[PDB]
A paper describes a structure:
[name] Deficiency (PD) is an autosomal recessive rare disorder caused by loss or reduction of [name] enzymatic activity due to variants in the [name] gene. The [name] gene encodes the enzyme [name] (EC 3.4.13.9), also known as [name], which is the only enzyme in humans capable of hydrolysis of dipeptides containing proline (Pro) or hydroxyproline (Hyp) on their C-terminus. We presented here two high-resolution crystal structures for the p.([name]) variant of human [name].
The electron density maps clearly indicated the presence of an imidazol side chain rather than a guanidinum group at amino acid position 470, proving the success of the introduced amino acid substitution. The obtained crystals were transferred to cryo-protectant solution containing 25% (v/v) glycerol in mother liquor supplemented with the ligands of interest (20 mM MnCl2 and 20 mM [name]). Despite an apparently unaltered active site architecture, the bound substrate remains intact. This was in contrast to wild-type [name], where a substitution of Mn2+ by Mg2+ ions was necessary to capture the substrate-bound state. In case of hProlArg470His, substitution of Arg by His resulted in lesser number of salt bridges. His470 forms interacted only with Thr289 and Glu453. It seems that the lack of interaction with the catalytically important Mn-coordinating residue Glu452 could therefore cause flexibilization of the active site.
Residue numbers in the entry:
A (entry chain B): 6 to 488
B (entry chain A): 6 to 482
Write the structure that this text describes.
Amino acid sequence: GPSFWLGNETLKVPLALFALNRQRLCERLRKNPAVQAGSIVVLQGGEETQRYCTDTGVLFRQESFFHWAFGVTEPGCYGVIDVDTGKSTLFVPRLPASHATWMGKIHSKEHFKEKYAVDDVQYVDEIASVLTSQKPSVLLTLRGVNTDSGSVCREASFDGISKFEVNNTILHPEIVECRVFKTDMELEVLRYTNKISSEAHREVMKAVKVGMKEYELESLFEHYCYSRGGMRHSSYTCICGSGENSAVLHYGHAGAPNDRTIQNGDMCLFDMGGEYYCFASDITCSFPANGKFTADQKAVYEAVLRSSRAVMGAMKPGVWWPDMHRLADRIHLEELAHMGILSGSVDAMVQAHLGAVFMPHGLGHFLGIDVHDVGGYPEGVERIDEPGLRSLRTARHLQPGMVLTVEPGIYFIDHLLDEALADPARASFLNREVLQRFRGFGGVRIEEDVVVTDSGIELLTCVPHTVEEIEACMAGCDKAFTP
Amino acid sequence: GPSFWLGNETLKVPLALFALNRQRLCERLRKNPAVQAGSIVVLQGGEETQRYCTDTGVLFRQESFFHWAFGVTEPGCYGVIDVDTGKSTLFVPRLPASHATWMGKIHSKEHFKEKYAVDDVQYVDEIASVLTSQKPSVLLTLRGVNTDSGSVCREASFDGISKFEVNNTILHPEIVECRVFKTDMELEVLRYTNKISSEAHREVMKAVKVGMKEYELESLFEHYCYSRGGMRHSSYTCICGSGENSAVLHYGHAGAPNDRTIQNGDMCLFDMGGEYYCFASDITCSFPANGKFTADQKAVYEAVLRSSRAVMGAMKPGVWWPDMHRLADRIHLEELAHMGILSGSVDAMVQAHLGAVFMPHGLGHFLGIDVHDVGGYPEGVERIDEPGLRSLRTARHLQPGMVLTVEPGIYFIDHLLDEALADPARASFLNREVLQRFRGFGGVRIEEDVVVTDSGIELLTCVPHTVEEIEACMAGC
Ligand code: PRO
Ligand code: PRO
Ligand code: MH2
Ligand code: MH2
Ligand SMILES: [Mn+2]
Ligand SMILES: [Mn+2]
């Protein structure tokens, strides 16, 4: 069957991937005792947008649930799936004749049927008549809360939908659960997004020079991903933090726009990931700007490497993800004590939540069509109300097919360090005579993407993440070179 | 005073630029007989957005009117201007402590006052209290219709605004008219955006090879503009049309996403422009993929070059922009007739609107903060209901300080050609036996950005646009 492909060395993605997702969704809904016979899933695709009131078009990127079910890149579509039969119908806009002058060929409905391997294609303005003819019992629309944004997924609507019975509660938890477990075809795409992003990270590490602006490397990363990977989008705005900016977890946004000059002795923390056909990647490489770790930089880096490796070695089905976060905390505290930054009982440090001073974010998150992917907190899975752990994007137990980031880090964040020094329950663990030397260090994060298997994990990422590999990469060594 | 700068060789833009815009706006409002003493202009900045219901942040780009007035890059702000005194007050978000962990330094109000050279800075949550203290007669908010999108500019709102008298009709035409006329400081930025975009077009022309995907050149263009020019955004989605796609005027969007392989013998039409600090550029280069014009490609190309140069040379204050569009039409028809595609009286072809078959779009448009900049059709300026001219984005007469694109083109668009061939009033002019050789040609567009001066124009763009220049650039010369 047909495939999405951007030529050259880019990945061919079979449209069968989306047919399987639809099949899996129907199979799950058929098992759901509350789903009525004759139900139809109704999804509304994204629409094209402009900047504010101007006619400046914004490049259209499909809504993620609609993409997951259909793989459709055109704006203005709807899509329906008959639960009982699995039959799929794509609704496409009826375009004006002038479209052929300004925007491109006005493809036939049959063109879209063959392109997307759906069972039927109709025009959007006929949706009410088409659905009436199918005599559905209930329309299942999409409404629910994203647990990272807090936003409500807005459900499909069309003129005449009020004449149908509409249920907007069943579908969201079910399609979310389908998205949590990646198919073999989806894993091929996530292997590819990690491959290209890993290559781009290596090119960035080879290119960094003292005196460059952070955004020069953002630009290079995105250029590699697009020109060599066909990744028109990134999965999120590139985080290119040098020096003290490496302690700012989502640095690089419009208010702090990757505009610092890289200086000798700085650590760089580059958290970047290209997106291919709406599939994410998320990789973080930390490294010295000048290509040579100092003793202090090596020690911090090695501490995060130890926690990364311990978590990856422990991950398997049945493991509770908060336990991995606590494991990383304990290891960071142990290693910071071995460095002389902390002293005393690590057991007592953990009770005082001292780990969250150095790692205020979650250990890692589901990844998929969204970089912070859906399904981390389904009903009954509670957020843990403690420093650090409350920022975890899931508190689930690991199961085969989940895709997670593993991204421990250690940072030197002045307001968190000063809070600890003002708190009698935490202050005594800090050795200011050594800590002072790490003020303004920034931080280190080591992030890889992994798949939970039947017995452990598969590593998707291939970047230089040991001290020796990093120094070798920055010295221009071939990838195949093993220091 | 302070300047916006992204380091390296990027342009330092003085924040005085925006102070001058605020002063010019107040000067216009003070002359408006409907404006009451004690009025305050209230603008609302753009807010950060995410992809649909996800937490995936969209890179924030400021709303154009707010940028024009204040130059502010942070989301979530408001800005007000006392009309009588010109005093400016910026309102910034009061950020939570966690901002320092996740997003960066929590700058003080004094930092923002120094950065933006405004008279006062307050927190957004104080806007109602601050404005109440000033006892305004009326708040002037922004509402009006963009004549390219048809969308309504949404006016500022804040908690408590219902307690004030609000006027939402006066401001839009006045701030639009100020944007139409670029200051010398604005022109310096548009010279720079054209400089970097021109350099990037040259790099793209040198890099094009048969067998590449169109999007490889989109990527290179944007990489040059960002890494070398500090242009994090483009002014619009890059149009990288090869072969038949060069006849698709806004090719490159998500439904036709620059995904064709460039083939030997194809024409390329690359319409791309980087954006620096929310100032646009818009440049188009057309050229043969293999670096050598065929006779047919050269003839089409030189026809568009002729109209490009004729229009630029005729532009001066007082010229009616529709006349320039018709001038390009007439030249195209003359040249297509010389090539044997057309036959008969060019005067009669013009009366039949045949030029619009080959150039269905407007000759060019205002350019500024937005690539299709505001103010093309103020009240009293009417759109001309004829093929081609109806797509003109302004029907104004030219005046000094206006910034225009000049972008004639000739395209071979099947449905327009076929409609003309069905019409006995136009079919006689077309020679099917010659036209058939140009079916699937695509098209040629040549675009320059210019400023109207007291005596003529100043050309901002510097790209290879003669056949000799193009072939030399592409041969690695
Ligand atoms: O948002 C998160 O969960 C991770 C933490 C570091 C940056 N991204
Ligand atoms: O939209 C416009 O007015 C011009 C015509 C060709 C592409 N841009
Ligand atoms: O977390 Mn990247
Ligand atoms: O027209 Mn660009
Ligand atoms: Mn991540
Ligand atoms: Mn233009």
